[PDB]
């Protein structure tokens, strides 16, 4: 669900401005809540009006030389509250850790100012987030060292998005494969919406893909597939993301979309989409 999940009850998440996704919710009590749709967690001691806003990494990075040493590791949020209100915050990050291939010390939290940027160390790393105690309200996000955009092939808990258009007994598929980020998902959904391309939800790859790795999209039913090989790379939500166009023109109930590594030809993800599952 989109609402923040707490022991008492999910708090209603009201959107202030959909052109910038300004949300604001009232922590009704002390305790610990979380929201999975964004992957955020919060631990507070009072009942406080917390303000959550999305913002693109690129517009704060246009001045700093960060992006050639530390790679973006998660969505960059903007938090507002009273000072003595929030005790612990937990920022999501799409980096995979479960095999321990990458170290749990190289993470950092970003804190922007007019001077420059401050690079804090999280209080605790966890397989899906980073912990921060007593935050100073700023645009905050998770950074990973070692510039792994081409190096270290660091695992990425990626996701896959499917968009469709019917148009009178036809079907056309836009298949996105991105890192796990709420901002990128939201930007994709927005840009697709103004083309009547609606999304359909499907389980994501249950394994850890690699950065820059090639991935051949294919299917059992021979159809039209435009870019044969997608990449798993990161590009700011304000830009345009790669995908694949598929002129499935389904003539059969089950079409098994599939993707395969190019290096070792290993199969990773498959999903069969039926009719009726759409509108």
């Amino acid at each position: 669900d989109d609402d923040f999940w707490g022991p008492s009850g999910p708090v209603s998440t009201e959107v202030v401005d959909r052109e910038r996704n300004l949300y604001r919710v009232r922590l009704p009590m002390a305790g610990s809540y979380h929201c999975p749709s964004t992957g955020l967690h919060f631990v507070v001691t009072r009942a406080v009006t917390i303000e959550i806003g999305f913002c693109a990494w690129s517009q704060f990075l246009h001045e700093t030389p960060l992006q050639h040493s530390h790679m973006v590791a998660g969505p960059l949020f903007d938090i507002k509250a009273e000072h003595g209100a929030v005790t612990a915050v937990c920022l999501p990050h799409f980096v995979s850790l479960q095999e321990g291939k990458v170290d749990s010390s190289l993470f950092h939290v970003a804190h922007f100012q007019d001077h420059g940027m401050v690079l804090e160390t999280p209080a605790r790393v966890e397989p899906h987030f980073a912990v921060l105690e007593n935050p100073s309200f700023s645009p905050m996000g998770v950074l990973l060292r070692m510039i792994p955009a081409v190096g270290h092939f660091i695992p990425i808990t990626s996701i896959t998005l499917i968009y469709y258009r019917l148009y009178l007994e036809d079907i056309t598929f836009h298949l996105y494969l991105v890192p796990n980020d709420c901002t990128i998902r939201k930007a994709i959904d927005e840009e697709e919406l103004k083309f009547q391309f609606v999304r359909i939800n499907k389980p994501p790859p249950v394994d850890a893909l690699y950065v820059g790795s090639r991935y051949i999209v294919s299917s059992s039913k021979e159809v039209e597939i435009l870019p044969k090989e997608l990449e798993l790379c990161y590009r700011s939500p304000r830009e345009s993301q790669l995908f694949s166009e598929i002129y499935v023109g389904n003539i059969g109930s089950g079409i098994n979309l599939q993707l395969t590594d190019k290096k070792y030809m290993n199969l990773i993800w498959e999903a069969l989409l039926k009719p009726g599952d759409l509108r």
Binding site: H62, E63, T64, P65, L66, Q67, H68, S69, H70, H108, H111, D114, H115, G116, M117, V118, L119, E120, T121, M146, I147, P148, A149, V150, G151, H152, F153
Partner: protein, 837 residues
């Protein structure tokens, strides 16, 4: 037992090189350039300093002016990564399509600037005035002082003009920031910024637009000076205004009438036309030089009332015989003297000379009036040769010189001076000398003796010493703090593989204190207030990072102020996917001489194997190849060579720099004959220490001296080297300029024995008879070492029948610039080794 490299198709090699460059790891393509620190009043905000510099933040391929605020009281536990704020709102500084005029493109080739946009700038501190050249002309802006510091980028103001050609070399008058100077159509000009008025002060260039007919020039550095001595200016402002407000400018006038001319193809190939250059080859005549003043007087509103120009009361060549070059020149900070550095022709006697402005008289052709000027000069006015350095190898030219503004001690003159020919190593000295006078009679001409204006030394105190040296060339400087009696410099006291920052009291030569962390090589620049400094450093296994440090500590003992890490401006990358950093080693020779080196051991190695090797080599002076810096972006082709299975061996034999004089002085008059023995001795050593070196298949490869050395190895050691890939070689030594060949090789009149055995084109009959054992590469437009050198070598190969191959780069000067010529160079490089090794 041996190992055979995989065979790839040509397109396959192209693909692997494209991939190795794509996997470079997103380099910054430029680190923050020369900085300026400007204090701020504390009540103005939270910051305490503003830092100006040049750089490209990966956004555009255009170097630009940036600034950053230095915070106050930054907290320790969290790293602070300063921003790069723009200062010129959306102003592109590269010309249209990136094509420069011939003057500035030749200057970029002389300075080796491989970046587009604003490359340098001039900055006046008090007025906070920035003046530079961008697009095709001059621009200026104001941010520092009375204007108040900016928050948003502002627009640069173009300086309107009426001249025809390009305005070169702008310089802001220190005494008054309302004016500036520049060079236009090979002459000197002074202009105002506010009133927009201009004025020309030199009348040497006809403007006939033909290098052949108008030889004279005023206030500009010739070719041999720009290339072989690294001075890119000819004019200098007097930093004090004398009292109407009079301003002085010391400049030089060159006369290239008798200099030999040559023709070089032009970047426009279709025209099939050439450009002429005054290129003095070894043994020929260098241009005639002289020093002249150029006064100009203004009033309260900034109008140039008068504008004279004066000269020495004697011909420059008469007072100073045996002077062939003007290495450096400038003023003192009070304006009481103008100084210059003279080199004789054999380049073995450099000397500082101090000249009072009163010795410059207007150019009076009427002999009656001239004898009046030569009568009105005060008595205590005369030239002063404060220092003289005579050697037995050669004189390397330093910029390091810092005179102290003297109080009313009329006798004394104290200054620091990085002398190198005294102990064999470059060390700082504090020397005080008494300016003795003789009260000359300038009316009667004088034939000066060898010791006419030489003033005697009163003291000469060494400040540093040991088997190491102080960095003095390639843009290295010292910073002298006169409020604490210290001097900050850079040297190799720790190890010849690292450049570190140091400080020592110049009043009492105590103990030296290193200010940088060991295990790296540092290039740092102090502040003018001596409270902060920025350091740019890296190591063999780490890419560069740029940190800023703050000198804190008790104010009573300034020598031991501890350097505190304050913030960062750039971090490392570590280039993880395919870059194995090389491994530095060192050995001894049979003459008991320690040499260093490095080896790129092959990827995916196996015991009991042998790999083909590629002895990369430069070997020439003034270049050190092996040092503890990151070679990951400069020479990555060697990593690609290693990625295929080749074992690359670099070695800095006798002749390289950073190891003293007596070590470098092994090439004297024997250039060519001695540097290979160190390469083969250091190649057989790696056969013992390591075991994967296949001495059966040994290549060799160089560029512009290693190209010359690639050919000498194949001649002297045909059994050691199977192939030889020379790049832009220097085949004949009698066709290279004076500034370099005479320094090391002692013009052919004297060294005709060594010129014979050093010129590789005169021994073509010893090259291999078999084919596929010699590749030659050269750029067509090259003007440093012309295409003639390769062209004359090929001519000698045919007179003997020896085979060869050749690759020409038509649109490339001495340095491969476009990517298509770079790719094609490496793609054809791998293919030659793949087949013929």
């Amino acid at each position: 037992a041996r190992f055979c490299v995989q065979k790839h198709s040509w397109d396959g090699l192209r693909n692997i090189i494209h991939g190795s460059r794509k996997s470079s790891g997103l380099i910054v393509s430029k680190a923050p350039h020369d900085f300026q620190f400007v204090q701020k009043p504390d009540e103005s905000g939270p910051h305490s300093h503003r830092l100006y510099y040049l750089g490209m933040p990966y956004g555009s391929r255009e170097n630009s002016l940036l600034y950053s605020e230095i915070p106050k009281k930054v907290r320790k536990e969290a790293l602070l990564l300063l921003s790069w704020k723009q200062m010129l709102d959306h102003f592109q500084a590269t010309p249209h399509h990136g094509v420069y005029s011939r003057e500035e493109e030749l200057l970029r080739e002389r300075k080796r600037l491989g970046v587009f946009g604003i490359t340098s700038y001039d900055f006046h501190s008090e007025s906070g005035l920035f003046l530079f050249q961008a697009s095709n002309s001059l621009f200026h802006c104001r941010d520092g002082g009375k204007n108040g510091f900016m928050v948003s980028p502002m627009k640069p103001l173009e300086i309107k003009t009426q001249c025809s050609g390009p305005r070169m070399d702008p310089k802001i008058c220190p005494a008054d920031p309302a004016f500036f100077s520049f060079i236009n159509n090979n002459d000197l000009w002074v202009a105002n910024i506010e009133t927009g008025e201009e004025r020309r002060l030199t009348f040497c260039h006809q403007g006939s637009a033909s290098v052949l007919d108008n030889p004279k020039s005023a206030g500009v550095a010739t070719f041999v000076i720009q290339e072989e001595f690294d001075r890119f200016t000819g004019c200098w402002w007097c930093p004090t205004a004398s009292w109407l407000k009079t301003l002085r400018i010391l400049y030089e006038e060159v006369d290239e009438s008798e200099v030999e001319v040559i023709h070089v193809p032009s970047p426009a190939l279709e025209e099939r036309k050439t450009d002429s250059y005054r290129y003095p080859r070894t043994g020929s005549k260098n241009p005639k030089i002289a020093l002249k003043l150029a006064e100009l007087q203004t009033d309260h509103q900034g109008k140039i009332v008068s504008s004279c120009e004066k000269e020495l009361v004697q011909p420059f060549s008469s007072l100073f015989p045996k002077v062939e070059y003007i290495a450096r020149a400038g003023w003192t900070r009070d304006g009481r003297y103008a100084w210059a550095m003279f080199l004789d022709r054999p380049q073995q006697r450099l000397q500082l000379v101090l000249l009072p402005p009163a010795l410059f008289i207007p150019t009076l052709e009427s002999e009656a009036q001239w004898q009046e000027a030569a009568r009105a000069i005060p008595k205590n006015v005369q030239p002063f040769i404060i220092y003289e350095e005579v050697t037995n190898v050669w004189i390397n030219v330093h910029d390091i010189f810092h005179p102290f503004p003297q109080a009313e001690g009329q006798q004394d003159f104290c200054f620091l001076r990085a002398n190198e020919c005294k102990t064999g190593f470059c060390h700082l000295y504090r020397v005080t000398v008494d300016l003795k006078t003789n009260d000359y009679d300038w009316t009667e001409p004088l034939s000066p003796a060898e010791d006419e204006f030489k003033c005697p030394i009163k003291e000469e105190v060494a400040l540093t010493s040991g088997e190491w040296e102080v960095l003095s060339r390639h843009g290295s400087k010292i910073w002298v703090n006169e409020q604490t009696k210290l001097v900050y410099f850079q040297g190799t006291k720790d190890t010849p593989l690292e450049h570190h920052l140091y400080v020592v009291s110049y009043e009492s030569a105590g103990e030296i204190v290193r200010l940088t962390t060991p295990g790296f090589s540092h290039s740092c620049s102090m502040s003018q207030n001596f409270d902060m400094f920025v350091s740019h450093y890296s190591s063999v296994s780490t890419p560069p990072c740029v940190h800023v440090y703050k000198l804190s500590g008790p104010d009573d003992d300034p020598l031991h102020k501890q350097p505190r890490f304050w913030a960062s401006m750039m971090e490392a990358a570590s280039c993880p996917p395919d870059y194995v950093p090389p491994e530095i080693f060192h050995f001894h020779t049979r003459a008991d001489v320690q040499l260093y080196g490095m080896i790129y051991k092959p990827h995916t190695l196996q015991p009991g194997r042998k790999h083909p090797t590629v002895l990369f080599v430069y070997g020439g002076p003034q270049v050190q190849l092996v040092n503890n810096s990151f070679k990951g972006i400069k020479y990555l082709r060697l990593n690609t060579l290693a990625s295929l299975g080749y074992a690359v061996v670099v070695i800095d034999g006798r002749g390289s720099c950073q190891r003293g004089l007596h070590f470098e002085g092994a090439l004297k008059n024997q250039m060519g004959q001695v540097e290979i023995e160190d390469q083969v001795e250091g190649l057989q050593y790696v056969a013992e220490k390591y075991g994967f070196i296949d001495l059966s298949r040994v290549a060799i490869h160089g560029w512009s001296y290693g190209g010359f050395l690639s050919l000498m190895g194949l001649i002297h050691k045909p059994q050691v080297f199977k192939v030889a890939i020379a790049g832009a070689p220097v085949t004949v030594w009698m066709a290279y300029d004076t500034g370099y060949t005479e320094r090391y090789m002692d013009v052919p009149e004297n060294n005709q024995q060594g010129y014979e055995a050093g010129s590789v084109a005169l021994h073509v009959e010893k090259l291999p008879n078999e084919p596929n054992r010699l590749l030659i590469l050269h750029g067509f437009l090259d003007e440093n070492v012309h295409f003639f050198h390769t062209n004359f070598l090929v001519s000698q190969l045919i007179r003997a029948g020896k085979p060869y191959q050749l690759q020409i780069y038509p649109n490339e000067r001495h340095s491969i610039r476009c990517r298509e010529s770079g790719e094609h160079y490496e793609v054809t490089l791998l293919h030659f080794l793949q087949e013929h090794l």
